[PDB]
Amino acid sequence: QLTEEQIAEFKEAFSLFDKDGDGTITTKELGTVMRSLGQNPTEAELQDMINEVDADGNGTIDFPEFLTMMARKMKDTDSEEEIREAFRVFDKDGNGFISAAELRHVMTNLGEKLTDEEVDEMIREADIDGDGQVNYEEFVTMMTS
Amino acid sequence: DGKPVWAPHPTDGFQVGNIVDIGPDSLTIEPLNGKTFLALINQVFPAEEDSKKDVEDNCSLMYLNEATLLHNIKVRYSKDRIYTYVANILIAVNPYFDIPKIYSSETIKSYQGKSLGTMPPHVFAIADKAFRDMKVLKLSQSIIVSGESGAGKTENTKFVLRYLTESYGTGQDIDDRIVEANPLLEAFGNAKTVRNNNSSRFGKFVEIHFNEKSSVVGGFVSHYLLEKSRICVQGKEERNYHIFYRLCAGASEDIRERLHLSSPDNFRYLNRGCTRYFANKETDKQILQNRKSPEYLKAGSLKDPGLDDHGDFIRMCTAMKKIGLDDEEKLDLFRVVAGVLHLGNIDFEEAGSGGCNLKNKSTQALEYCAELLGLDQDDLRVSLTTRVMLTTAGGAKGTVIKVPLKVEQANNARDALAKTVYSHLFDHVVNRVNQCFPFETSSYFIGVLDIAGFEYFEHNSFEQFCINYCNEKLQQFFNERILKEEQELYQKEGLGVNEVHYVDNQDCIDLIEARLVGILDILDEENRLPQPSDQHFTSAVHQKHKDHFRLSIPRKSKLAIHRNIRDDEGFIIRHFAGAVCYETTQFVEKNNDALHMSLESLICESRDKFIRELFEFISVGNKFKTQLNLLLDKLRSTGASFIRCIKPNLKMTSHHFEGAQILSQLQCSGMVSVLDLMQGGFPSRASFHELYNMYKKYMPDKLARLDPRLFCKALFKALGLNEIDYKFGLTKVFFRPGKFAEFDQIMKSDPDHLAELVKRVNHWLICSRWKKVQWCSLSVIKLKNKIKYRA
Ligand SMILES: [Ca+2]
Ligand SMILES: [Ca+2]
Ligand SMILES: [Ca+2]
Ligand SMILES: [Ca+2]
């Protein structure tokens, strides 16, 4: 279903949810991250999502569970539209570009502790054409690296 | 280089030293205090550089071996941290004082639902893991506890049952009812041994039973392998079961006269052993002079702060009352006990008319025994000295004949009957105890096992052989379960494909118990020969197993005390815990305890109904095997957790860690076997949080700000670590043996190389951090959608 590399990337995503590092995601941990990315699910909508997938029955999501929770039947056109809404999460105002205070906006929300000189450096690394901002072309190059 | 090692020390177990010379098989050690000494290479172990380090899980050590374990638990014991893990195995050192706070209701509540890694080490965490696995897997659980008698095992079980009943029970105090009955179980199943005043001589499995909603409904005591040989004979520093002495010391003169009791020097079944009572200055004054044996009068009482024959008799009587044992059932128990004692005094003499007669001096013993057991004296006289046999064996029509017994066969019939009666009485006491917390039904249980551990002395006989056999089998069960847990952990952590090379002890087990060719069947074969002999049995073992890895003649022992033991006078078995030299004198007589059918029928139809109710071809070694296998079948049908109880010294003293003694227990308990098993996998591992806190001081601030996992991914990637030795798991970095120490040296040995390697990881790390938040955005969107899938 997912390839070798794509599984490896979602494990690091998984780490963003599992803040306390016990290898398990709780309902509380699951909502925070969705929230911090501009989302509003109810304590009913999430628990229903956990239970459908909580095979081993222990009331928390492990990495195997997490992945099945990602997955669903869909077309190669609906899947790469996810990639574009992802690309649209960073761009707060919506002008086609992630600024330092914007790429920084996801960070603080996500709980990444950095400095402005660090932010500015992440930008510089993804900028293939040399302009100084990140295009969907680049995004996908980076994400898929 | 000049690194600290651990080398042997005769009272601390190990001491710190430096290697100053090498030899073919040994190393020359300089104690950190120039009195060098030699040590075998395999008794010298690498030491943690930080001698004041204390970790909660020994798997966090940079070297995991018997010496570093011993030291970690020593450091923790000096801070009153009595509990320490090795993975999920709990090590528990008896404090010998009441530790404030750790057993309170608040502490109980803090352990509920918490994973084992997330709280400090504690018996409660082991109780709670058992519970959660029971509830979630719909699987009964065993908590398997090792340790010497007195190593804190009793208190440990109490804490488990208290945790389970108070947490998951409904106001009903099963734990207290089980505990109120202990004086009765100990009276019938415990005895003084050469090392332990209050040694349990049976396997005891204390079960808390649960309904389908995982709430406590009741308890059951399962019991196994009562030591039968002690009923009739003991060595000189040992006693029979406590009940015999409590009864003689403490029974009123009225009960004494009725049961015809007298001091214990007057009973064969007591008088080869120590006939002295446990008493202090005051209780000695409460024992009538006619209860006191000559050894008691010459040598005085045995001293123990928590055991007293006179007072324990009263305590036992109080507990029989507190749990419903009425006074008539009390005297019924006592009547059977004294019946067995008088049975043992019956002697026999060769007839020469054929067979034997009861000596005439045994007429009162016979009179007393038959009355107490409710049997016709003449019927008993005949069934003790004669048996019935059919005139054929293979289907042809036969006749019942009477066959007179020789004296030796009559001694065996009297002792066989003694053993069957006492064993059925024990079985009765336990069933009666279980009638104090009965339950209609249950779906699962959590049980705590307590059974005699592996042991050896200067002289090891058949008793030790059976005990060490039992422990060899429990150790295989322990190894299997740890192997399975570790394989499972490595899979859950995403470590990939890996075989943990397992050297099994099936071969030792097969040596003892294999059909036809095992030591126990060869011992049964000796019974069938014209002139059974221990020496012929023993030569047969050596003949059949010439080439066996786990067997040697005594001559080959390292020890001097075995120098002059002949090939046909003993054997050495290489057990999990080390080599044991068994002297085989009396193995054959100890392998027989059969009760011929007429005598057993006699007792089964006693005049007395209590005796009748008690009672409603196979060697001792094979009955042992059979019952042990029933114990194992039970354990094998449960999830297993493991506790190792440790006695810190032999003087009941707080704050006194005796190293060699604790080392020897770690070996005998199977912990060292487990550590050897763990060297085949990844025995050292550390959480990202632990690694982040140890090593952030060496990194640029840029890195110090990363979360612990990305900090470690960065450091791991920057160093170019060999993919075989180091494994980056889900929640921990896993190391092959010694490889965490090697990681630490890389981190310490060349700051400029390190700085450059970290410089060069910059790009990879910028990207990894892109992808983290990126794919975390993509994950929030996929979740958002999965809620939309309802459409
Ligand atoms: Ca978590
Ligand atoms: Ca789960
Ligand atoms: Ca923008
Ligand atoms: Ca660009």
Q: In angstroms, what is the span from residue A71 Cα to ligand 3's centroid? A: 30
Is residue B19 within a helix (H) or strand (E), and if so which, with residue range? strand B13-22
C-alpha B121: how far from chain center? 21
Query: Which residues are CB-contacts of B570 (< 8 A; sequence separation ≥ 6)?
Result: B538, B553, B554, B562, B581, B582, B583, B584
Nearest CA to B350 out of B360, B361, B338, B358 is that of: B358
Q: Which residues of B touch A113 (CB under 8 A)?
A: 705
Q: Is B733 helix (H, G, I), strand (E, B) or coil?
A: strand
Do B690 and B606 have their domain in common? no
CB atoms within 10 A of CB B319: 20
Q: Which of B636, B655, B681 is the last residue of a domain?
A: B681
Do B637 and B704 have their domain in common? no
Q: Is the Cβ–Cβ distance between B182 and B221 less than 8 Å?
A: no
Q: What is Dmax (Cα atoms) for chain A?
A: 51
Q: In angstroms, what is the span from residue B2 Cα to ligand 1's centroid? A: 43
B688–A13 C-beta distance less than 8 A? no
d(CA A139, CA B704): 27
Residue carrying structure tokens 């702060």: B305
For residue B265, what are the domain limits?
1-681
- What is the helix, strand, coil percentage profile of chain B, to 5? 50, 15, 35
Q: Which of B624, B655, B681 is the last residue of a domain?
A: B681
A23–B492 C-beta distance less than 8 A? yes
Q: In angstroms, what is the span from residue A28 Cα to ligand 1's centroid? A: 9
Neighbours of ion ligand 3 (CB under 5 A): A 91, 93, 95, 97, 102
C-alpha B719: how far from chain center? 45
d(CA B789, CA B357): 93
Q: Which residues of B touch A49 (CB under 8 A)?
A: 783, 786-787
Residue carrying structure tokens 């069947």: B521
B199 is catalytic: yes
Strands B83-86 and B26-31: unpaired
CA distance to partner chain A, nearest, from residue B26 (Å): 45
B252 is catalytic: no
CA distance to partner chain B, nearest, from residue A122 (Å): 6
Helices B182-189 and B407-434 sit at what angle, rounded to 10 degrees? 170
B200 is catalytic: yes
Nearest CA in chain B to A114: B705
Structure tokens at B766: 């910028």
Question: Beta partners for B39?
Answer: B27
Residue B576 phi, psi dihedral angles, 5° rounding:
-60, -35
Q: Which of B142, B149, B471, B641 is catalytic?
A: B149
Nearest CA to A27 out of A39, A43, A15, A38 is that of: A43
Name where chain B breaks: residue before each gap, C-N > 2.5 Å. 33, 353, 616
Strands B216-224 and B83-86: unpaired
> Closest-lying ligand to the alpha carbon of A14?
1
A110–B773 C-beta distance less than 8 A? yes
Q: In angstroms, what is the span from residue A46 Cα to ligand 2's centroid? A: 14
DSSP per-residue string spanning B535-556: HHHHHHHHHHTTT-TTEE-GGG
Distances B193 to B53, B187, B228, B273, B455 between C-alpha atoms, Å: 39, 14, 14, 10, 12
Q: Within 13 A of A36's CA, how many CA atoms are on the CB side?
A: 21
Q: How many domains does chain B have?
A: 2
Do B635 and B660 have their domain in common? yes
Residue B57 DSSP symbol: B
Q: Is the Cβ–Cβ distance between B366 and B346 less than 8 Å?
A: yes
Distances A40 to A91, B340, B459, B780 between C-alpha atoms, Å: 19, 79, 75, 11
B455 is catalytic: yes
CB atoms within 10 A of CB B657: 19
Residue type, B122: H
Do B657 and B693 have their domain in common? no
CA distance to partner chain A, nearest, from residue B762 (Å): 10
Neighbours of ion ligand 2 (CB under 5 A): A 54, 56, 58
B781–A86 C-beta distance less than 8 A? yes
d(CA B760, CA B758): 5
Q: What is Dmax (Cα atoms) for chain B?
A: 106
Residue carrying structure tokens 């029928």: B601
Tell me which residue in A34, A70, A112 faces B773 most closely, judged by beta carbons. Answer: A112
Do B30 and B174 have their domain in common? yes
Do B768 and B673 have their domain in common? no
d(CA A56, CA A63): 12
Q: Which of B150, B169, B203, B339 is catalytic?
A: B150
Residue A53 phi, psi dihedral angles, 5° rounding:
-105, -15
d(CA B776, CA B230): 69
Query: Which residues are CB-contacts of B27 (< 8 A; sequence separation ≥ 6)?
Result: B7, B19, B21, B38, B39, B40, B41, B44
Nearest CA to B415 out of B404, B425, B426, B423 is that of: B423
Is A22 annotated in a binding site? The answer is yes
Do B631 and B777 have their domain in common? no
B782–A70 C-beta distance less than 8 A? yes
Do B640 and B762 have their domain in common? no
Residue carrying structure tokens 């150790």: B475
Is A26 annotated in a binding site? The answer is no
H helices present in B563-670, as ranges = 587-590, 597-604, 609-614, 620-636, 659-668
Structure tokens at B423: 């064993």
Q: In angstroms, what is the span from residue A20 Cα to ligand 1's centroid? A: 5
Is residue B85 within a helix (H) or strand (E), and if so which, with residue range? strand B83-86
Q: In angstroms, what is the span from residue A91 Cα to ligand 4's centroid? A: 14
CA distance to partner chain A, nearest, from residue B56 (Å): 16
Give the dihedral of Cα atoms B481, B482, B486, B491; nearest 10 deg: 0
Q: Which of B68, B190, B199, B385 is catalytic?
A: B199
Structure tokens at B73: 């638990």
Q: Which residues of B36-47 are buried (b: 16+ CB within 10 A; e: fewer)?
A: eeebeeeebbbb
Do B32 and B154 have their domain in common? yes
d(CA B488, CA A56): 14
d(CA B624, CA B202): 12
Do B627 and B748 have their domain in common? no
C-alpha B43: how far from chain center? 25
Nearest CA in chain A to B767: A142
Q: Which residues of B624-633 are buried (b: 16+ CB within 10 A; e: fewer)?
A: bbeebeebbe
Q: Is the Cβ–Cβ distance between B522 and B538 less than 8 Å?
A: no
Do B366 and B506 have their domain in common? yes
Tell me which residue in B772, B775, B786 faces A72 most closely, judged by beta carbons. Answer: B786
CA distance to partner chain A, nearest, from residue B767 (Å): 7
Helices A116-126 and A136-143 sit at what angle, rounded to 10 degrees? 100
Q: Which of B49, B329, B455, B463 is catalytic?
A: B455
DSSP per-residue string spanning B173-194: -HHHHHHHTHHHHHHHHEE--S
Do B622 and B719 have their domain in common? no
Nearest CA to B556 out of B575, B541, B571 is that of: B571
Residue B220 phi, psi dihedral angles, 5° rounding:
-145, 135
Residue type, B482: I
CA distance to partner chain B, nearest, from residue A27 (Å): 12
Q: Is the Cβ–Cβ distance between B293 and B302 less than 8 Å?
A: no
Residue B475 phi, psi dihedral angles, 5° rounding:
-65, -35
For A13-144, where are the E strands, in sequence order? none
Q: Which of B250, B453, B518, B621 is catalytic?
A: B453
H helices present in B8-122, as ranges = 66-78, 105-111
Q: In angstroms, what is the span from residue A76 Cα to ligand 3's centroid? A: 27
Q: Which of B681, B707, B730 is the last residue of a domain?
A: B681
Residue type, B727: K
Nearest CA in chain A to B769: A122
d(CA B413, CA B407): 10
Chain A contact for B784, CB < 8 A?
yes
List the binding residues of B for ATP.
147-154
Structure tokens at B299: 């040598």
Residue type, B390: L
The experimental technique used to determine this model is: X-ray
B150 is catalytic: yes
Nearest CA to B669 out of B175, B73, B253 is that of: B73
Distances B307 to B279, B346, B360, B607 between C-alpha atoms, Å: 8, 32, 39, 36
DSSP per-residue string spanning B455-518: ---SSB-HHHHHHHHHHHHHHHHHHHHHHHHHHHHHHHTT-----------HHHHHHHH-TTTS
Is A129 annotated in a binding site? The answer is yes
DSSP per-residue string spanning B341-394: HHHTT--EEE-----EEE-GGGHHHHHHHHHHHT--HHHHHHHHHEEEEES-SS
